Symmetry: C3
Subunit: 307 residues, 3 copies
């Protein structure tokens, strides 16, 4: 439509990493996501992907990611074939490759989540249709990064210039890896606080490939093992994560007394006690809204890929 033009660059293409997107890619998707959101909240009913099929291939469990993918597909008028791993012909000795080839025979796109990092590369090698990396081990989670970025944009108004805190298990947290990559390559970030005990800090295999962009844009990088008052007062985003002593990163109503008036708290979810329920009532808690921005970002993605 004039109203919902797909993002041309994403057509017919798998999504494995946040590295594959340009700054233009992200904003085209953001604006497309906002258009999708306005049409849906009005009660408009899209038939954009009628006759098209997504198949989830989840070798690890998910609540959100599965559900937001499916809902996104459906709200575009597309369909889902409900493949399960536990009740499948994997049990009879079949291999990942043959499994992938199989669902490929029937589908227009695959959404894959897997505990091994290099499993996705293997899926690409045998797949004809697009695969969307919905999480590869401790590797990446690219579409979360995109929707995270939509959230920041939509809530605060700009992504350029922000100071962001990445909190929790940065070592194994695939969300924070895609997010860092996405933000630093495609925006001008003031400062990034990496908040974690040393054991779970942001890995070098993430930081080093970003170093040129970090340096060239003059982005500040500080490591702390705590949510110190400096982190609380300066951050426009507190993005915190699950584990995969804890007092020094927990965010509660009290801690929130030190935050600015114009900032948000975000969490890819699910959460443990790092993010107290005391916070939920605060208009700065955007971690529930995040999931709805998720659905619309995923509509944008699916449409752009399959248009």
């Amino acid at each position: 439509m004039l109203e919902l033009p797909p993002v041309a660059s994403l057509k017919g293409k798998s999504i494995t990493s946040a590295e594959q997107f340009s700054r233009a890619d992200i904003y085209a998707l953001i604006h497309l996501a906002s258009a999708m959101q306005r049409k849906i909240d009005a009660g408009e009913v899209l038939n954009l992907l009628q006759g098209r099929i997504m198949t989830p291939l989840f070798f690890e469990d998910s609540s959100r990611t599965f559900s937001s993918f499916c809902a996104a597909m459906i709200r575009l008028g597309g369909s889902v074939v409900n493949f399960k791993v536990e009740a499948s012909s994997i049990n009879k000795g079949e291999t990942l490759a043959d499994t992938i080839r199989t669902l490929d025979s029937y589908s227009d796109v695959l959404v894959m989540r897997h505990p091994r990092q290099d499993a996705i590369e293997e899926a690409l090698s045998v797949a004809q249709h697009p695969i969307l990396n919905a999480g590869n081990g401790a590797g990446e989670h690219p579409t979360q990064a995109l929707l995270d970025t939509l959230t920041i944009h939509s809530e605060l108004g700009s992504v350029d210039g922000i100071t962001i805190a990445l909190i929790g298990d940065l070592k194994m947290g695939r969300t924070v890896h895609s997010l860092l990559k996405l933000l630093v390559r495609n925006f001008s970030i003031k400062c990034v606080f990496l908040v974690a005990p040393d054991a779970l800090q942001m890995p070098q295999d993430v930081l080093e490939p970003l170093q040129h962009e970090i340096a060239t844009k003059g982005v500040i990088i500080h490591r702390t093992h705590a949510l110190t008052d400096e982190v609380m007062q300066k951050s426009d985003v507190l993005y915190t994560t699950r584990l995969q002593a804890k007092a020094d990163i927990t965010i509660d109503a009290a801690r929130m007394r030190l935050a600015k008036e114009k900032m948000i708290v975000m969490h890819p979810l699910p959460r443990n006690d790092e993010l107290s329920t005391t916070v939920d009532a605060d208009p700065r808690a955007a971690y529930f809204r995040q999931m709805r921005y998720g659905m619309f970002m995923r509509m944008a993605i699916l449409w752009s890929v399959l248009a």
Copy 2:
């Protein structure tokens, strides 16, 4: 069309938690709407009333009828289902009930929840922006079973006022009989209710006491029995029986009474010519297969009514 399938306005955008929330007029509007739903589906007509709306099942215990009929009802309105699991979720990585509700709520137009705890429903409500349809909360209620059950009685017998009905089996833990007693007693002039169970599994006081005014104003007879006596067999228009749901004395009393509360072809010889056997299902041997060929065996038709009655509910909720 609003001529053919007028939704039931009172149900617009509201959660369904109890049989207590409905009025007589509500139950009748839903009955007539379900029957109209049925006449269309049976004639091959396709409906598109709910294109682009999503129903998410949220089932923490097993189901065959209620899951499936809900999914089928939604599809037959042209709506969609997101097949969310609890066993294949991030509830494994330490996620709580409210967070789970707030999640599915981001995506859905209506939620359908079955949960082993009674209070699990009131907890979900407090955080949900979208209607939740209670598909069973522990041993509490199963309000939409009560509605399809009442649909069954009405379509098969022709009237609900004036009936004698026996509720049979595990009445303690049977959320089906809790909701069905409340809905009939509160909204119809029931002649007699037989409560057929051993003491250990009798109908709970917390169901019966809230009904005392209805019971006295409408003059309903309530008799407890521990057996399907000849009286109960000869006088009942509806025999509605239930599985025994699996502390020590309950097991035993159930063992002591099982043959007395079992319905089989032999027992049906004492039944009226016009009456019905019902069972929300699933069943064990409290209801013999020997009864399945009898015209009064209404427990299979019962399921189909469920789909059509849930079509009426879904459409009225989301109109």
Copy 3:
């Protein structure tokens, strides 16, 4: 302008339990219809033929191709699927098979049933109002597999009559080879069938005897071996090999042992050097090491294209049953 999708009339309103219930004419008609399904779906066209119709899977043992393929096919006709799970259902409270059939039959227009008991499909039939498609009954039959297997031979080789076909591997428990042998011998002029299997896993007498009349009357040569001889490799137009059906205890052990121990049935690039230029390798799937990944590059490897054929054969089956 476009192709018609006439339903195959004789399938209307009927259960599919066995390869035996099909005539040659039904097979070609379904084949042709599946090809027109193919050309429509691959052209991007959106089918709305079975809107408002419901398919319910009633799988009492694992499946990937078959479950997924049926759901896809239903979706691509404009139909819908109620994702009922046997393992997470009221059977875990003692519900019978029949009550479970009657349950889903209450909501569905068609049931796709797979079950480890040979006779369970029979149980199901006796109570279901709506058609049931047998998607696997123990070690019995797998009749939609046979139909797609035949599609795959037709589209790939150009003819089914006149072919020499090897059925290899676990022929005793292999429901797929059971239905396919029956379906080929009763409706086509097969030149020769090689039965490549160790003695313990050979093709059973309860499949071979009912076909005796047909085999003799039509001159169908039948050769048993326990190895992929050079003869078998050199003469065969189709190498349809199969997985050892482990899921199906001391003769049991010797039967498991026999596949690779009294073997020589592995197919790999080395064995393939001996094959015709014009031939195909098929495997209904999943595979184990009987079908090496070294064959996958070979254009003669048809076992992936087979799963695609199968979706289209299945769209054809479902439209014909439900139109």
